[PDB]
Amino acid sequence: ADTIVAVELDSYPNTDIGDPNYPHIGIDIKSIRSKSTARWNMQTGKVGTVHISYNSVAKRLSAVVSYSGSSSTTVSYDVDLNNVLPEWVRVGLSATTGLYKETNTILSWSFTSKLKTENSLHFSFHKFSQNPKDLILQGDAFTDSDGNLELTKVSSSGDPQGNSVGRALFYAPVHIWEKSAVVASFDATFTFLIKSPDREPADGITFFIANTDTSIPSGSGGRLLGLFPDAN
Amino acid sequence: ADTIVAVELDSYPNTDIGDPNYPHIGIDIKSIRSKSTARWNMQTGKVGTVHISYNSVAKRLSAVVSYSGSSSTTVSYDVDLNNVLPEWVRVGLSATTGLYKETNTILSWSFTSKLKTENSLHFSFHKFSQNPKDLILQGDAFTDSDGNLELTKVSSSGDPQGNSVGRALFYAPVHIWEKSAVVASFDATFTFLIKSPDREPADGITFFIANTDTSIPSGSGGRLLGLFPDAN
Amino acid sequence: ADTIVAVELDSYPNTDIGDPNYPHIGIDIKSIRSKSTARWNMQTGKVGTVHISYNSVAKRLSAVVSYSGSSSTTVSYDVDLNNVLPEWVRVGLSATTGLYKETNTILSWSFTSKLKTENSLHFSFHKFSQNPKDLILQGDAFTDSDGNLELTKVSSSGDPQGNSVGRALFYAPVHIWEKSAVVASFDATFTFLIKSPDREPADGITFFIANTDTSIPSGSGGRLLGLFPDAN
Amino acid sequence: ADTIVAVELDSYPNTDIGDPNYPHIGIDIKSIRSKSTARWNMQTGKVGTVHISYNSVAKRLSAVVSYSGSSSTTVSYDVDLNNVLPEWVRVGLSATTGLYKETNTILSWSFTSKLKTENSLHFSFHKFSQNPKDLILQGDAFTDSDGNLELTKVSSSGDPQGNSVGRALFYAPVHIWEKSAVVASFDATFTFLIKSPDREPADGITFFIANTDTSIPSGSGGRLLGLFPDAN
Ligand SMILES: OC[C@H]1O[C@H](Oc2c[nH]c3ccc(Br)c(Cl)c23)[C@@H](O)[C@@H](O)[C@@H]1O
Ligand SMILES: OC[C@H]1O[C@H](Oc2c[nH]c3ccc(Br)c(Cl)c23)[C@@H](O)[C@@H](O)[C@@H]1O
Numbered sequence: 001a002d003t004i005v006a007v008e009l010d011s012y013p014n015t016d017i018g019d020p021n022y023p024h025i026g027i028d029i030k031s032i033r034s035k036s037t038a039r040w041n042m043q044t045g046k047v048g049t050v051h052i053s054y055n056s057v058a059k060r061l062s063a064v065v066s067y068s069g070s071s072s073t074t075v076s077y078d079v080d081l082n083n084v085l086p087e088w089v090r091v092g093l094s095a096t097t098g099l100y101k102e103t104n105t106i107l108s109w110s111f112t113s114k115l116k117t118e119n120s121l122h123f124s125f126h127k128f129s130q131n132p133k134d135l136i137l138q139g140d141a142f143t144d145s146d147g148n149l150e151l152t153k154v155s156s157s158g159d160p161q162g163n164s165v166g167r168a169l170f171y172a173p174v175h176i177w178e179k180s181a182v183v184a185s186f187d188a189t190f191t192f193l194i195k196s197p198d199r200e201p202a203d204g205i206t207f208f209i210a211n212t213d214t215s216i217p218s219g220s221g222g223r224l225l226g227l228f229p230d231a232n
Numbered sequence: 233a234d235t236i237v238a239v240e241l242d243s244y245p246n247t248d249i250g251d252p253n254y255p256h257i258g259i260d261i262k263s264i265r266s267k268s269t270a271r272w273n274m275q276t277g278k279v280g281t282v283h284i285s286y287n288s289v290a291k292r293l294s295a296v297v298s299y300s301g302s303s304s305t306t307v308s309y310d311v312d313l314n315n316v317l318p319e320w321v322r323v324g325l326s327a328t329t330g331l332y333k334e335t336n337t338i339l340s341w342s343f344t345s346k347l348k349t350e351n352s353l354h355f356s357f358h359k360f361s362q363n364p365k366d367l368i369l370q371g372d373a374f375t376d377s378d379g380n381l382e383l384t385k386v387s388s389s390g391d392p393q394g395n396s397v398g399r400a401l402f403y404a405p406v407h408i409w410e411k412s413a414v415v416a417s418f419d420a421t422f423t424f425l426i427k428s429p430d431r432e433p434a435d436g437i438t439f440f441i442a443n444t445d446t447s448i449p450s451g452s453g454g455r456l457l458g459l460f461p462d463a464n
Numbered sequence: 465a466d467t468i469v470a471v472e473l474d475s476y477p478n479t480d481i482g483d484p485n486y487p488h489i490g491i492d493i494k495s496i497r498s499k500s501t502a503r504w505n506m507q508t509g510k511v512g513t514v515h516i517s518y519n520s521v522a523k524r525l526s527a528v529v530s531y532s533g534s535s536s537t538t539v540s541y542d543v544d545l546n547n548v549l550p551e552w553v554r555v556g557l558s559a560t561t562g563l564y565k566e567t568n569t570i571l572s573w574s575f576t577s578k579l580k581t582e583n584s585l586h587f588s589f590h591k592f593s594q595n596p597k598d599l600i601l602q603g604d605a606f607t608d609s610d611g612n613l614e615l616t617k618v619s620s621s622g623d624p625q626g627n628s629v630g631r632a633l634f635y636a637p638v639h640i641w642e643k644s645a646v647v648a649s650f651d652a653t654f655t656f657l658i659k660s661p662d663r664e665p666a667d668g669i670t671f672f673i674a675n676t677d678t679s680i681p682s683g684s685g686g687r688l689l690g691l692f693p694d695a696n
Numbered sequence: 697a698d699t700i701v702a703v704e705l706d707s708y709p710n711t712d713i714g715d716p717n718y719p720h721i722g723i724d725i726k727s728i729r730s731k732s733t734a735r736w737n738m739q740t741g742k743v744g745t746v747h748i749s750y751n752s753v754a755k756r757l758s759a760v761v762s763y764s765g766s767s768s769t770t771v772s773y774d775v776d777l778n779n780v781l782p783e784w785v786r787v788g789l790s791a792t793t794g795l796y797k798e799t800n801t802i803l804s805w806s807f808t809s810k811l812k813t814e815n816s817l818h819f820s821f822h823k824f825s826q827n828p829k830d831l832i833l834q835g836d837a838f839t840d841s842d843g844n845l846e847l848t849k850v851s852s853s854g855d856p857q858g859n860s861v862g863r864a865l866f867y868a869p870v871h872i873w874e875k876s877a878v879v880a881s882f883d884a885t886f887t888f889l890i891k892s893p894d895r896e897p898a899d900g901i902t903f904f905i906a907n908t909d910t911s912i913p914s915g916s917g918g919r920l921l922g923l924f925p926d927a928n
């Protein structure tokens with residue numbers, strides 16, 4: 001059972017398992033039920049931009065989500081990630097659709113990791129090549145002709161499908177801590193396009209971190225964002 | 233048969249297959265016989281520092297090697313790497329020993345890759361963890377307790393062994409070009425410690441680039457620097 | 465460049481690169497141009513059955529192809545496979561379509577390997593599971609709902625597409641020889657269904673053997689049966 | 697957390713976690729505490745021979761262990777393995793040493809798997825090649841010059857070391873059941889040589905079956921036989 005730290009743009013309120021009454025960004029520490037959430041002023045059809053940061057000195061995983069010239073949405077959570085995640089991990093983006101759907105388009109994805117014990121891993125994508133050998137595409141994750149990472153299924157038309165799960169891991173494992181390490185930090189940006197024919201888009205996109213061999217958990221569809229085998 | 237672009241710190245003169253009469257840095261385009269070389273003022277026992285750069289606009293692979301406060305050694309070569317290397321590659325460091333030996337210690341290794349079509353892959357190591365999951369260690373390559381990448385065999389004493397070959401690839405494939413790409417560049421630094429009981433150290437260390445599935449070619453020992461199956 | 469030993473059911477005559485004037489079974493030793501061929505009495509729409517055998521004592525790779533109660537077609541070739549193939553290999557089935565097409569259905573596939581130095585590897589498939597984890601499916605190779613290995617593309621209708629290449633490797637590398645080995649033999653059976661709307665079906669199906677890391681060579685489509693990067 | 701079905705030749709009594717008072721063979725269904733055990737008349741220095749069988753109709757995992765012309769030791773357990781193990785698995789041999797040690801030599805290892813829904817996977821080893829590419833060697837598992845699989849560490853002298861863990865998985869995943877399958881069976885033989893300077897040899901050898909991605913669990917040393925992260 002994978003260890004998971006995710007920042008969720010939870011498109012779909014699932015009150016029956018923790019979610020607030022509304023679209024929200026959440027910080028998930030080994031549970032789909034977010035340790036912290038903020039009301040996310042969704043804007044379907046516009047391009048969102050998530051920034052994620054954290055160092056091991058401040059011990060505060062923080063995420064902001066924004067649209068151009070629009071009021072942003074921040075959510076923080078005091079956590080020491082080296083007590084949660086293994087020493088080595090892989091970073092990725094996941095997204096699902098349930099009975100309700102939405103395009104989970106990733107227009108770009110950067111991520112910087114620093115381990116001053118000064119080791120480092122930076123990577124950024126503004127274009128997603130047809131064959132991304134530096135990405136372990138899991139489930140329904142693919143890349144379209146516009147150089148966009150489609151995390152979840154989308155017809156040739158552009159319409160999103162439902163009951164789809166897909167994630168993109170960066171091929172190289174990251175080293176986010178070492179007993180010796182004085183400070184391990186990481187940042188993570190990505191822009192996304194969420195479009196939906198439904199007035200209740202679902203289910204969400206997330207940037208997560210996990211055991212290197214992390215794979216899509218069975219039953220992880222929909223409100224589970226392809227991160228957990230259950231809702232505990 | 234792998235495609236190979238390497239920058240060699242050729243410790244050992246092998247005149248009988250191209251090498252100059254002396255220790256030298258070479259730029260190898262799909263051949264152990266360097267398209268360009270410069271006389272390398274070796275300093276066994278001191279820590280060297282190779283810087284490598286190249287963009288696709290200038291089309292000039294250049295490398296400099298230096299010791300602290302000592303006269304450096306530069307070597308350049310006009311080449312268009314996208315006509316040589318495949319679209320996707322893996323970057324690494326190799327080193328061998330023949331009948332003559334030497335420690336092939338890598339104290340650090342950074343590498344930045346930029347694909348403005350602005351995609352990117354940066355990674356740097358000042359410490360090499362006991363288990364580097366973000367490095368495909370090939371052959372005799374291992375990491376010692378001092379956090380140093382030993383490319384080639386070295387007894388517990390510290391003495392180097394001979395007839396050893398070892399390389400370190402970064403786990404993630406790099407994208408160094410795209411038909412669309414306007415400019416693909418990359419830099420690569422690394423510091424090394426070459427020590428030898430022999431007054432004729434051998435055989436050398438190299439930073440190379442290759443087809444992603446690049447592996448140590450049979451017969452690639454010694455003067456082949458674990459890069460080629462032959463000397464053509 | 466992979467080492468390849470294949471037994472080809474060459475559906476399509478390609479005279480301009482060696483092929484006989486007619487559909488034929490060929491034995492290919494590191495070349496699409498068969499060292500031996502026999503006239504293959506094709507029967508599109510009926511289920512064929514290839515048996516392949518060889519031991520290192522007799523040094524005779526032999527293949528027979530048959531349809532129920534129909535005159536079979538045998539082809540032999542005296543070769544010592546341990547002088548051709550590496551010590552370790554992977555066994556598989558490949559098939560392509562060019563401008564002309566055909567279904568490349570594999571209804572079953574067994575293979576026995578014996579290394580008396582008595583080591584062994586047997587595997588047989590009468591059903592191909594939706595997710596064959598014990599098969600490295602390459603290119604357009606997939607498995608349909610009838611439990612059939614579709615080597616090459618086929619519409620939902622059942623019509624075959626063209627310019628498609630796909631192979632199925634057995635996940636485990638086989639050990640087909642050892643310097644010590646007294647006798648290494650192997651057999652290989654498989655039944656196939658070739659159907660075509662075209663009166664000139666193309667291009668063929670093959671059981672091949674190759675370096676373990678064998679992958680579909682670029683330009684290997686059509687008359688190359690997804691085995692060679694060229695016709696030499 | 698891996699799913700594990702093992703047949704243990706538990707060299708070392710660990711009463712404080714279930715073990716009988718004596719060396720024994722056990723059948724472990726997702727727990728180091730055997731669902732069934734029989735008193736194992738150990739014979740250190742002689743070559744043992746374990747036979748394992750099971751089909752899904754009888755639903756009885758059975759194992760026998762024997763030495764030449766010596767009273768054997770049988771242990772059975774009524775279990776339906778398709779309710780325990782995933783649909784796809786990898787089969788292997790594991791062994792550890794704790795504060796007490798012993799050579800865990802595997803002189804041979806066969807295994808037949810049949811899935812009549814008649815699919816099959818057979819493999820046998822009487823010799824273990826220096827580089828067994830068809831074996832995922834985990835931990836301290838290696839192969840010596842006599843063609844023997846040393847599961848656990850052994851000095852050049854031949855003396856076994858302690859606190860060592862090593863397993864050998866067959867490279868190809870096995871298909872041990874399918875919803876459709878009418879009967880899935882498997883057999884598994886292997887001969888072993890257990891030698892110890894200690895009058896209380898430890899800890900044991902096992903043939904196990906697990907989720908394909910099974911790896912040595914942390915803390916699985918000694919009485920855990922490199923199968924479980926704990927003793928529950
Ligand atoms: O796409 C959003 C969701 O759809 C499903 O839950 C549903 C939310 N509204 C519903 C209305 C009816 C039924 Br039945 C279901 Cl399962 C749901 C589920 O598939 C969820 O996993 C998911 O959160
Ligand atoms: O370590 C350096 C070299 O040693 C060998 O070549 C030798 C250079 N000096 C020699 C002197 C005698 C003999 Br025999 C040999 Cl092979 C050599 C070879 O093993 C080379 O590959 C290598 O370049």
Ligand SMILES: OC[C@H]1O[C@H](Oc2c[nH]c3ccc(Br)c(Cl)c23)[C@@H](O)[C@@H](O)[C@@H]1O
Pocket residue numbers: 476478561562563564565666667685686687688
């Ligand atoms: O499907 C069979 C074949 O089709 C092609 O060659 C053709 C055989 N008949 C033709 C007629 C016209 C043209 Br243009 C072509 Cl390329 C061909 C090629 O694509 C071949 O690789 C292949 O053997």
Ligand SMILES: OC[C@H]1O[C@H](Oc2c[nH]c3ccc(Br)c(Cl)c23)[C@@H](O)[C@@H](O)[C@@H]1O
Pocket residue numbers: 708710793794795796797898899917918919920
């Ligand atoms: O090799 C056998 C065993 O050695 C250890 O347990 C010991 C059995 N006898 C002992 C006596 C003292 C101490 Br401290 C220990 Cl840990 C043990 C442990 O390391 C066990 O995992 C193992 O079963």
Ligand SMILES: [Ca+2]
Pocket residue numbers: 010011012013014019203204222223
């Ligand atoms: Ca939700």
Ligand SMILES: [Ca+2]
Pocket residue numbers: 242243244245246251435436454455
């Ligand atoms: Ca040289």
Ligand SMILES: [Ca+2]
Pocket residue numbers: 474475476477478483667668686687
């Ligand atoms: Ca042909």
Ligand SMILES: [Ca+2]
Pocket residue numbers: 706707708709710715899900918919
């Ligand atoms: Ca025990």
Ligand SMILES: [Mn+2]
Pocket residue numbers: 008010014018019020026032034
């Ligand atoms: Mn939520």
Ligand SMILES: [Mn+2]
Pocket residue numbers: 240242246250251252258264266
């Ligand atoms: Mn040189």
Ligand SMILES: [Mn+2]
Pocket residue numbers: 472474478482483484490496498
């Ligand atoms: Mn032919």
Ligand SMILES: [Mn+2]
Pocket residue numbers: 704706710714715716722728730
């Ligand atoms: Mn026990």
